[PDB]
Amino acid sequence: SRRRVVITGMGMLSPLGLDVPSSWEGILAGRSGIAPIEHMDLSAYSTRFGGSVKGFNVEEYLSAKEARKLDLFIQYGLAASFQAVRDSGLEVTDANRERIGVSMGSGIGGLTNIENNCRSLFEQGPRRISPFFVPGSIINMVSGFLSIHLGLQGPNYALTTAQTTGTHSIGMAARNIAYGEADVMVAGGSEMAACGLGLGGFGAARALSTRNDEPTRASRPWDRDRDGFVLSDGSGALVLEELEHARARGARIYAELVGFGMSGDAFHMTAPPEDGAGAARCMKNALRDAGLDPRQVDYINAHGTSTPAGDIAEIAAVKSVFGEHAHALSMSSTKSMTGHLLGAAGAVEAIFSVLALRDQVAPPTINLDNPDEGCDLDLVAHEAKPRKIDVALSNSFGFGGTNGTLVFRRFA
Amino acid sequence: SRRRVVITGMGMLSPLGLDVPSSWEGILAGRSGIAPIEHMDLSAYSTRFGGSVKGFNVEEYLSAKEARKLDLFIQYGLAASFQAVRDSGLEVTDANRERIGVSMGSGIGGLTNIENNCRSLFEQGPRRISPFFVPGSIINMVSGFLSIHLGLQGPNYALTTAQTTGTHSIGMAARNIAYGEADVMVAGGSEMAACGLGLGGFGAARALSTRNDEPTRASRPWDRDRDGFVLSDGSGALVLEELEHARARGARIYAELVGFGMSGDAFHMTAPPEDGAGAARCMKNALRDAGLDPRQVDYINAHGTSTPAGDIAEIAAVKSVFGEHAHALSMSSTKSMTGHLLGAAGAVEAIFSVLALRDQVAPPTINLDNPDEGCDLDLVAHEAKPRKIDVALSNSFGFGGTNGTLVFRRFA
Numbered sequence: 001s002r003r004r005v006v007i008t009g010m011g012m013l014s015p016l017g018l019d020v021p022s023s024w025e026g027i028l029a030g031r032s033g034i035a036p037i038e039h040m041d042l043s044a045y046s047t048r049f050g051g052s053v054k055g056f057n058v059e060e061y062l063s064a065k066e067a068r069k070l071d072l073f074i075q076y077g078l079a080a081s082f083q084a085v086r087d088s089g090l091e092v093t094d095a096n097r098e099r100i101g102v103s104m105g106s107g108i109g110g111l112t113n114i115e116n117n118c119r120s121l122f123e124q125g126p127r128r129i130s131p132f133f134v135p136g137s138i139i140n141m142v143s144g145f146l147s148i149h150l151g152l153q154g155p156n157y158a159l160t161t162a163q164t165t166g167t168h169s170i171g172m173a174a175r176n177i178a179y180g181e182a183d184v185m186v187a188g189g190s191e192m193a194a195c196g197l198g199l200g201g202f203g204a205a206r207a208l209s210t211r212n213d214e215p216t217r218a219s220r221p222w223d224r225d226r227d228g229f230v231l232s233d234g235s236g237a238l239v240l241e242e243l244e245h246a247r248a249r250g251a252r253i254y255a256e257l258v259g260f261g262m263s264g265d266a267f268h269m270t271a272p273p274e275d276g277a278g279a280a281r282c283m284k285n286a287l288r289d290a291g292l293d294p295r296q297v298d299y300i301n302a303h304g305t306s307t308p309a310g311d312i313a314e315i316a317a318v319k320s321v322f323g324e325h326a327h328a329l330s331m332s333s334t335k336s337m338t339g340h341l342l343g344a345a346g347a348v349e350a351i352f353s354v355l356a357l358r359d360q361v362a363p364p365t366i367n368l369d370n371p372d373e374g375c376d377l378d379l380v381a382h383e384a385k386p387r388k389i390d391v392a393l394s395n396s397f398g399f400g401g402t403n404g405t406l407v408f409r410r411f412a
Numbered sequence: 413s414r415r416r417v418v419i420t421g422m423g424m425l426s427p428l429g430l431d432v433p434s435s436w437e438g439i440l441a442g443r444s445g446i447a448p449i450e451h452m453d454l455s456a457y458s459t460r461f462g463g464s465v466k467g468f469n470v471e472e473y474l475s476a477k478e479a480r481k482l483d484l485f486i487q488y489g490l491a492a493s494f495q496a497v498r499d500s501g502l503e504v505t506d507a508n509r510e511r512i513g514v515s516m517g518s519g520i521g522g523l524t525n526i527e528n529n530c531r532s533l534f535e536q537g538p539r540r541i542s543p544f545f546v547p548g549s550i551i552n553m554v555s556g557f558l559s560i561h562l563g564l565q566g567p568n569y570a571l572t573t574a575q576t577t578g579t580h581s582i583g584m585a586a587r588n589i590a591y592g593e594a595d596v597m598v599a600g601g602s603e604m605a606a607c608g609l610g611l612g613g614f615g616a617a618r619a620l621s622t623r624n625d626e627p628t629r630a631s632r633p634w635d636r637d638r639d640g641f642v643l644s645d646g647s648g649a650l651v652l653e654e655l656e657h658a659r660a661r662g663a664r665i666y667a668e669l670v671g672f673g674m675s676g677d678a679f680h681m682t683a684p685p686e687d688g689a690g691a692a693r694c695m696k697n698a699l700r701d702a703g704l705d706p707r708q709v710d711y712i713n714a715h716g717t718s719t720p721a722g723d724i725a726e727i728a729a730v731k732s733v734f735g736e737h738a739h740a741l742s743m744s745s746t747k748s749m750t751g752h753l754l755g756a757a758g759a760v761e762a763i764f765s766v767l768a769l770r771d772q773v774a775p776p777t778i779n780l781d782n783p784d785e786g787c788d789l790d791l792v793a794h795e796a797k798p799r800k801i802d803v804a805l806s807n808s809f810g811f812g813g814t815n816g817t818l819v820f821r822r823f824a
């Protein structure tokens with residue numbers, strides 16, 4: 001029989017902050033983390049801005065030596081993971097190390113380090129490829145390195161489901177606990193795809209905003225003048241824990257993870273169906289998993305990427321799932337502020353959903369000046385809205401038509 | 413309480429053949445699939461051979477247009493998937509499409525597409541980056557594209573756990589079925605890392621055999637003169653199916669998937685502990701999952717990568733788990749013949765384990781001329797061995813210390 005799963009620790013790097021509290025302060029203030037990119041020359045690119053992590057100091061977590069062997073996406077994932085475990089208060093011992101695992105994923109992974117080694121290969125030659133190229137670039141090395149540093153011997157894996165990664169990572173980790181394969185999991189996602197191939201690749205697909213003159217206004221989910229997503233970097237990690245395990249050690253419980261849904265659109269490689277039918281199936285799976293009446297959902301943290309086709313598909317899906325209740329719940333996209341953290345989006349947005357529960361407040365959709373046709377729900381335009389929130393749902397969708405939904409609830 | 417999971421279809425591309433029967437014929441014959449690499453110039457590299465897929469014809473599966481969008485690892489994964497679905501006889505309909513999902517993974521993913529996009533990027537900037545670069549290179553696109561082509565709407569995801577990927581993919585897919593989230597899953601892995609970055613990266617880590625003079629002798633698991641793994645390419649896919657679902661449509665059942673285990677070494681980024689303690693925990697977890705006493709295991713398809721440290725760690729783990737029964741079972745490494753398919757290794761080796769059950773024969777470890785110190789189990793040296801096999805176990809281990817074990821049994 002299925003065990004209950006709660007959240008006892010969280011950690012983050014985002015364009016708004018180097019930890020959870022600083023990021024969340026930005027969220028509730030409606031602050032943008034988007035700016036012209038400084039770390040490379042994007043003069044030849046159609047998009048020249050995004051959400052960078054500012055002032056990260058890897059040496060708070062790892063030595064210079066260890067850090068230079070690892071791509072930035074790995075460093076970011078480790079930072080968020082270490083923060084979450086610290087936040088949870090958990091002490092790893094021989095008595096529990098086999099019962100604590102890790103599932104930290106990425107969508108794009110080590111593209112940046114691969115691009116740099118590729119430069120070495122072609123400009124210098126093959127003997128300039130790093131000895132640490134493979135372990136420092138592969139997606140599972142967040143889980144790997146975290147387990148090595150903390151001594152975690154339970155299930156150890158990584159998902160890669162593009163922009164759905166972080167949501168799937170958390171949901172599948174919760175299944176491990178619910179079914180008895182672990183008592184504790186560290187789960188989430190990390191990304192740093194701000195390199196030539198990243199900006200260039202998403203740009204070639206015409207998926208990015210090109211509002212170069214006003215980067216903070218670029219990400220504008222459901223607004224009539226939206227023109228694509230804003231690429232952002234960072235990481236999110238949660239400590240998921242079996243309920244009785246948490247209670248026995250006197251852990252602080254932020255919220256309960258009650259539902260997880262998955263689906264496939266089976267429609268198109270890079271676009272959802274106009275009616276968001278796949279997203280609707282995914283949400284219904286998550287609601288049924290949680291044993292809920294859809295009218296119990298108070299807050300939705302949308303995927304809200306600011307693409308023309310994506311944002312309206314999600315409205316359609318929400319209307320299909322919730323009926324008239326779609327007008328009672330609040331739904332917002334925190335990507336309005338953070339931009340799109342790709343494989344880490346679902347992780348940071350899970351955190352934001354948990355914090356919406358702790359603080360009884362719906363984060364805003366900033367930049368929502370003129371809602372587009374049919375976008376007539378309570379989208380929490382401009383300003384955070386204090387309200388009752390007993391149940392929060394968080395959606396992620398990805399290229400390939402891969403969908404995930406998490407459902408969190410206040411714990412008492 | 414948990415539903416039973418059986419295998420009803422299989423598909424493969426390997427260095428031994430373009431499908432399962434051809435590959436398996438090679439396995440039973442002790443044939444090597446290793447040769448000098450022909451598709452690129454490795455004259456200045458320290459390793460110039462590996463296991464290539466010979467004569468793959470993508471136009472049996474995809475249009476030229478579709479094929480030009482997709483990295484070779486995705487093409488290979490799709491080929492194996494299409495073969496497995498055909499082999500299963502499953503008819504996808506509106507009545508079942510929400511019950512059929514896909515979990516096909518990769519260890520390193522789109523290295524070749526990245527490498528090809530690199531060259532232009534550094535000489536002439538991002539102008540020539542394809543609009544399909546991102547969807548055609550991300551690891552979840554095997555799952556994505558397969559779902560789109562066949563209309564599969566069930567759980568849709570991808571693992572990336574380096575050399576463990578194929579095993580974890582099959583195991584986690586089995587859980588989806590056992591727990592009622594799907595009735596059918598296509599699962600496995602694919603890889604095509606034979607490029608400058610791949611050969612150069614693994615070569616920089618000093619992980620590859622450099623036996624260029626005798627490529628077919630290079631892969632020699634447990635032999636005293638082994639000197640690293642042999643890099644190979646391909647894919648494996650299984651159709652996993654709930655037992656009653658299979659019975660109701662009169663499916664041919666190859667075998668039952670009874671156990672899945674996972675662990676982490678929490679030891680080192682690129683090496684196992686000398687005693688294989690992580691691998692031992694993983695195998696025990698899989699046996700506990702299956703409700704089997706270690707004395708019930710008849711055949712182990714080892715990870716057997718032909719590395720100095722890897723091979724002996726696995727012997728130690730087997731001795732620890734199985735005690736005196738370690739002397740009764742047979743264990744072999746088919747990587748002696750196929751080389752190391754990385755993220756696809758656990759998929760093709762799951763298939764080989766299923767076929768060992770069908771045909772009651774332990775595949776050989778070829779090249780085992782002089783077993784190393786302590787390598788004194790029945791390692792099926794040189795020649796296939798007909799014997800009773802009721803229970804077959806298959807191990808995969810990966811950089812980061814990530815471990816997976818599958819347990820299959822004859823179905824009557």
Ligand SMILES: C[C@]12C[C@@]34C=CC(=O)[C@@](C)(CCC(=O)Nc5c(O)ccc(C(=O)O)c5O)[C@@H]3[C@H](C[C@@H]1C4)O2
Binds near residue numbers: 207271307309397
């Ligand atoms: C063929 C076209 C049609 C096109 C036209 C209008 C659009 O709006 C876009 C730009 C984006 C559609 C979309 O939102 N896809 C989408 C998705 O399915 C799942 C997740 C995300 C995410 O960012 O996490 C995402 O971005 C599409 C893309 C690129 C190209 C232009 O496909």
Ligand SMILES: C[C@]12C[C@@]34C=CC(=O)[C@@](C)(CCC(=O)Nc5c(O)ccc(C(=O)O)c5O)[C@@H]3[C@H](C[C@@H]1C4)O2
Binds near residue numbers: 617618682719811
């Ligand atoms: C730092 C060192 C020490 C060194 C010394 C002797 C060795 O034998 C090797 C070559 C490989 C160890 C090993 O087997 N790792 C290993 C593993 O843990 C899991 C999976 C696989 C697989 O191939 O699927 C694998 O390859 C190691 C590697 C590279 C480098 C040289 O680490």
Ligand SMILES: [K+]
Binds near residue numbers: 303345394396
């Ligand atoms: K979300």
